[PDB]
Design a protein around this nucleic acid. Structure first.
Ligand code: CA
Length: 314
DNA sequence: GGTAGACCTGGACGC
DNA sequence: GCGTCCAGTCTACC
């Protein structure tokens, strides 16, 4: 009853809602789509994970986003806590308003979007984002998800336990920069990315001015930020774009990888026109990125998530 | 400046 | 059941 992960039905008094139609947000399309790797649908239609340093379970009805927190007297979320949820889902950004625009300038987007409404961008913490995506390179979303989990259990702060799941906060820079972390990460299966994590943790802390250097990018321009991020080991233009798009409030950032190339070719008959090569390459990927920005506008990154997330769904 | 290849790991095809 | 194939960054090099 008071044990295990909650359900809307099971413990009514402990939930609270946030006005939010499914047209504006589809948890099933956002939480497992490779933006964040830390949410799990423990019970059907119920997603649990760490948000704002606490564990939550989220679920929705047609017009409401129901939320619950596990902090010590169990009680429904407070308006201030719920605000953290709205901020995490950037709910002040109107999706219907963005879909309309993208749809009006791109017939193909219009066609596809009709079936995949409610795909928006989560506003993520820079550190988790940086290291989660450092783990994403040349890898599949399933292994990635396993790596990040193991990473947080071994190095992140212990939160609360539900059923047989012990939740952990994402590791701090100090923890990731620690001694023998690389060796430990290799035993956890991160492969060669084990060194990237260790090396980037130290680089940020011992050469770039620490957490402040990263946190200050949310005020810098996309061009600056993206360039700054690329210095870090394991962080290329692609990983840097994901971070810019998902953590540094750069909605125009467009991560170009295999999915996007196939979409460009199949749905837009796109070809590199100024680039040297015909296939993927540093030059062509950059060009592809510009094509989508020019096509979708300032929130091209978000538009990208709609088609991307819809691609995984096939 | 702009290519080729190697690359940890493990669920998937291919056969 | 085995070998090969896939899900970005980095580096040696022409
Ligand atoms: Ca690939």
């Amino acid at each position: 009853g008071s044990e295990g992960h909650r359900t809307l039905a099971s413990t009514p008094a402990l939930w609270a809602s946030i006005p939010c139609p499914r047209s504006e947000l589809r948890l099933d399309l956002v939480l497992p789509s490779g933006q964040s790797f830390r949410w799990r649908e423990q019970s059907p239609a119920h997603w649990s994970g760490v948000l704002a340093d606490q564990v939550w379970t989220l679920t929705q009805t047609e017009e409401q986003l129901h939320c619950t927190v596990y902090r010590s007297q169990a009680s429904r979320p407070t308006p201030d806590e719920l605000e953290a949820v709205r901020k995490y889902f950037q709910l002040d950004v109107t999706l219907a308003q963005l879909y309309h625009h993208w749809g009006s300038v791109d017939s193909h987007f219009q066609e596809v979007a009709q079936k995949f409404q409610g795909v928006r961008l989560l506003r993520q913490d820079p550190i988790e984002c940086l290291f989660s995506f450092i783990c994403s390179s040349n890898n599949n979303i399933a292994r990635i998800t396993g790596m990040v989990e193991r990473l947080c259990q071994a190095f992140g702060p212990r939160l609360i336990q539900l059923d047989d799941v012990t939740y952990h906060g994402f590791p701090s820079l100090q923890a990731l920069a620690g001694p023998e972390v690389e060796a430990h990460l290799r035993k956890l299966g991160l492969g060669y990315r084990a060194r990237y994590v260790s090396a980037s943790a130290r680089a940020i802390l011992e050469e770039q001015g620490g957490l402040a250097w990263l946190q200050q990018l949310r005020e810098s321009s996309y061009e600056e930020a993206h360039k700054a991020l690329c210095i870090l080991p394991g962080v290329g233009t692609k990983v840097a774009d994901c971070i810019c798009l998902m953590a540094l409030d750069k909605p125009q950032a467009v991560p170009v990888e295999v999915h996007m190339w196939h979409i460009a070719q199949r749905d837009y008959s796109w070809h590199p026109t100024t680039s040297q090569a015909k296939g993927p390459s540093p030059q062509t990927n950059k060009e592809l990125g510009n094509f989508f920005r020019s096509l979708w506008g300032p929130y091209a990154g978000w538009a990208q998530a709609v088609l991307f997330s819809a691609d995984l769904r096939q």
